[PDB]
Structures are given as structure tokens and as C-alpha cells.
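Q: Hi! First time doing this. I have a protein sequence and I read that you can turn it into a structure. Is that right? Here it is:
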Amino acid sequence: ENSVHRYKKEASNLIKLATPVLIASVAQTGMGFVDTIMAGGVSAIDMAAVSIAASIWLPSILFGVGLLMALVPVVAQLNGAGRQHKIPFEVHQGLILALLVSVPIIAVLFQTQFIIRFMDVEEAMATKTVGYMHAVIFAVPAYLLFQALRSFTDGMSLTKPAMVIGFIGLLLNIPLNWIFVYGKFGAPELGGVGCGVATAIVYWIMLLLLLFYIVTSKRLAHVKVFETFHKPQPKELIRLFRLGFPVAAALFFEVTLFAVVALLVAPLGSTVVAAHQVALNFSSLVFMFPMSIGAAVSIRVGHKLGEQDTKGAAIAANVGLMTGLATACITALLTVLFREQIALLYTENQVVVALAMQLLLFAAIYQCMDAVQVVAAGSLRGYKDMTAIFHRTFISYWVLGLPTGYILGMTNWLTEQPLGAKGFWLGFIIGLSAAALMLGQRLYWLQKQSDDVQLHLAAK
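A: Yes, that's right. Below is the predicted 3D structure, encoded as C-alpha cells:
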């Protein structure tokens, strides 16, 4: 029984969802930069790439309130072999909320696009291009919900829909991007105009894999048909909301606070690209890894809490912890070596490269640290209202860290640093550090008793 059934199930359930996600994510980010920067980027005399870039900084704040949704349908708990039914209706509500969110974000979108921050050349271009092509990017969230119930949740948890709309995703982007971003043959449109349509069509498929792999269930069913409005259950959408708040806010509000410190301390030189290229680009992908484990557990631990009301805590949690480590430990190590060329991330000169290389290292440490903080936090706790209180613990990791790790690279700006830039980068590590440990202190909390239903009497 000790671990025999853990490493066993852990093994399965873990990598199970993992591979689908880890790969799937590769799609999102993948198809993302690929058809986007490459095409409408290294095509429109570079004034195309970064264009859509900052542009996307925005479709970033969005994905924010996007996990709002996400956690909502990690509620694939109302399937711990339990109330297998009613879940169809829960969703319908989550999705309705999907719209209720997209629009509040149409706001953000349409208006900032219609005003931007400054003015150079991207403006009209990547701006409204994405403007409406991103009214389209509101149709995604909707999908994102599908994803939530199926892809992500998947009845109980069958995330094949990863590689589905995934491989297909990036794939159909390109041909559809060729033509629209360029390829006339129908209507040739500026580069960033095709990234825009890159996604418009992205949801063509998105909607497809959605309706199809879901209402179709080439395996399960016990699906949807005839849905309705709601205010009370939407007060449960206010449970979805009083969850999506602690998720959307949390992780992505932090996205801003990430850009904050970052930029706040971007006034150091070319060391921008140093730390920027370094940390961001790479570690953004490295994190993609622990993120993958995160949800894997989060749902393995939600379905496991929902069925036998067993110690998924044991399984899902501590495996996640165990493994996430293993990998962020694997990639932390796999990074010390592969720094250099990796460093040669952006195809440029030395530039940081060496110092980039210095940063690369700070990263490994972030990799691993981040990992625990990730799986641990967002998942295990991601399985219920702890999303709320753990968020607290989350933003606590931010103030302590950044304001201090920042003031720690800034301790160079005080005590000292054999490079303060890289330095406070590490200061950030003191962030992920406190966080990871902060959530480890939100450990089961008393472990779990009939208090789990306290999470099902607060989640219903």
C-alpha cells in the first residue's frame, strides 16, 4: 500500500495527463511564436514581429482571467466517479461565464487597441488587426472552457484533446497563416494581420475539436444538450467566480507584477536582452513543464478526492511534488549544460551570452524552485477554495520576493552583487522559494478529513 499504489498510480495518472498537456502547451506557445513572430515578424521587415508582440502582452493579461475559467473546470471533481451527472450542467454554466468573461475583456482589448500606450508603427497594424481578430480570441476562452471540461477536465480526466486541436493547431495555423499573413490566394494581409487570423482560424479548429471530441465522445458521453441561463448557480459562477478570481487574479495579476519588477529594473542596459532573452524566453518554456504537471495532479487530485474520497493527497500531491522536482531537477541540470546555445537563444552575437549564461544558471534554480511552487500550489491547492487562500500565500511570495529579491539584486543597490541584474534575478528565486515553501506550509492543512466536503460544501 505504501507508495506501491502511489508510484504506481502516480506513474500512470501523472505522465498520463502530463504528456497530453506538456505537448498541448507546446502547441499554444508553439503555434504561437511560430506562425506569429516568424511569419508576420521576420517577414514584415521585423516591423511585424515585436508588433504583434507587445500586442500579445495584452492577449496575455487576457489568458489571465482565462485560468479564471480553467480552475473553474478543474471542478472535474463532480466526477470522482461521483455525481457523474449534473457536471454537464455545471459546465454550461462555466461556459456561459466564459462569455461573461470574454466580453469584460473585449473591453480591455478593443479600447487599449484603440489607444495603445505610445505610438511608433505597430499601432494601427498589430493593434486592431488583433483588435477584431481577437474579438475572435474571446471565442477561444469559450473553447478554453471546453478544454476545461474535456481536454483539461475530460469527463473524469481524459486529456487526449491536447495533441488533438494541438498538433492540428499549430499545423492548420501555418497554411492558414501563409495565405492570410501573405499567400494572397484568397486575400493577402499584413504580417501581424495574419497572426491575427492565425488565431481566427485557430478557433475554427478550436470550436471543431471542441463540439466534436466533446458532444461526440468517441468513447464516453453523458454529455450536454439543452442548457439555460442562471443567477444562483452563477452565484456558483460566483463560486466559479469565487475561484476564478483567486486563479485569474493570482497567476496572471502576477503576470503584470512580473512585467513590473522586470521592466522596473529593465533600466540596466543591453543587459535587457541579457536577463530578458535569458530568463523570459527560456524559463517561460521551462515552466511550461511544471505547469503541465500542475494541472495533471490538480485534476488527478480532484477526481481522486471526488471518488473514494481517498488520499489522492498521498498520490496526486506528493507524486506531483516528487516528480515535478525530478524534471525541473532534470531540466535544471539539463540546462547547466545546454546553457550556451540555449543562451544563443535569440540568434545574436555574444551579448549577454556569457552573462546570459550567468543568468541561465539563476534560471535552473528558478526552474526547479518554480516547479514545486507550481505543482504544489496551483494544482493540489488548485483543487478547491485553497485556490483562494493559497493565492494570498501566492502574492505574499511576490511582495517578499520581488520587492526584496528585486531590492536584493538591489541589495547590490545596497549590500552587494557580482552582477545586481542577474542578482535580483536570483532575488526572484527568493520569491519562488518562499512561495514553494509557503504552499508546502498550506500542506493538506490538517491533512484531509470530512473537511474535504467542507470543500464540497464551499464548492457544492
